[PDB]
Amino acid sequence: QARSDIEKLKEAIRDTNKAVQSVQSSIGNLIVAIKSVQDYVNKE
Amino acid sequence: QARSDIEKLKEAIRDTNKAVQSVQSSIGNLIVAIKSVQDYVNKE
């Protein structure tokens, strides 16, 4: 059904968006990790 | 055609998902890189 498939496509994109959001959170923490090493190198 | 477009949307999301999977693999290796520098700083 075109209506069922349209809803399936919507939910698939929703899940892809959630995957991107998780990647975004990971990148925010990678920044923290890089800063930490650089700050550990400067403070000791 | 609505059927042709539904199939096009499906393949577009499939390719977006493959792009996210490549980004996920990159993030896994960024972790390795950060650990390496931190482990190189600790071991020498």
């Binding site: 496509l9 990647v23 923490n29 | 499939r14 999977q21 972790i31 931190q38």
Partner: peptide, 30 residues
């Protein structure tokens, strides 16, 4: 300190991979 941060990234990466698995399974059913 940094070890905890890297573990968070690993967990968030695992969640991301699972969301893509679900998206692809939905696509397979179209």
């Amino acid at each position: 300190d940094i070890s905890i941060v890297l573990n968070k990234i690993k967990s968030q990466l695992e969640e991301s991979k699972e969301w893509i698995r679900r998206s692809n399974k939905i696509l397979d059913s179209i």
